[PDB]
Amino acid sequence: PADLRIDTFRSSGAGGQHVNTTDSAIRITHLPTGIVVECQDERSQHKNKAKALSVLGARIHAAEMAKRQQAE
Amino acid sequence: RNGRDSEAKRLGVKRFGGESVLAGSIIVRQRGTKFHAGANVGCGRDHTLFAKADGKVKFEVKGPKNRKFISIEAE
């Protein structure tokens, strides 16, 4: 976590007054790879950031394995 | 998960040293047997040391294993 450009914004979707004024959507951009993962599921940003980190985990891990797999 | 607790049952001494009690007055509501029956007192089933007679309450520390006795100095 020193090169991870993290952004946040008003989540796009249904709700009420809450959803109009709540930065509950997170986007993780990884500078060395240039991969983007958007997520807006739960109300809490941290519950949403939980899912965000989880998916980004899979991404870089799996792409690097596929890289080695194809190269082999 | 927790939060269960039992309603306390008022233990401890009821008539301290120097008290003049009447016959039958409960002296100590002891749970274990921290105080042993000395003279003129009896040990109930709840180990409740009660005044078998009446007089003046006096504590002691006699006994070969240093255990507190409660005897009553007759008036």
């Binding site: 809490s44 940003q45 941290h46 519950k47 | -």
Partner: protein
Amino acid sequence: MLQPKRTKFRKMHKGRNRGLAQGTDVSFGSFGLKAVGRGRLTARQIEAARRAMTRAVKRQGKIWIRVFPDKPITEKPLAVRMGKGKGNVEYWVALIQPGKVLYEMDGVPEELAREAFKLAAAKLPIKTTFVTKTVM
């Protein structure tokens, strides 16, 4: 990270921190670092501090860690409402009363040992100092 193997209870009360210390004299080595301030050394801080002293002398010496955490400090999970029970055990701390010897070495020159503790001291929260072995 110096954690107590098999503790008696999982979580325990916060508790206040008063009085003075006990392990006051240098009793193992010849030079010791005594804490002047008041506060709490977290577990990983000691481990971090230990690495600092080791490389200061490069190889030699015998380092004695006088303190040991043993007190669990809990933490509430992010964005959770108050109540709902006590938080989970996160990190272990050691209450440090003023005048407590933290580390003490032996088997190195006095001047070189003076270099050692300044690296460690920067890596600890509470204000410390340096003290030698008292003949007593």
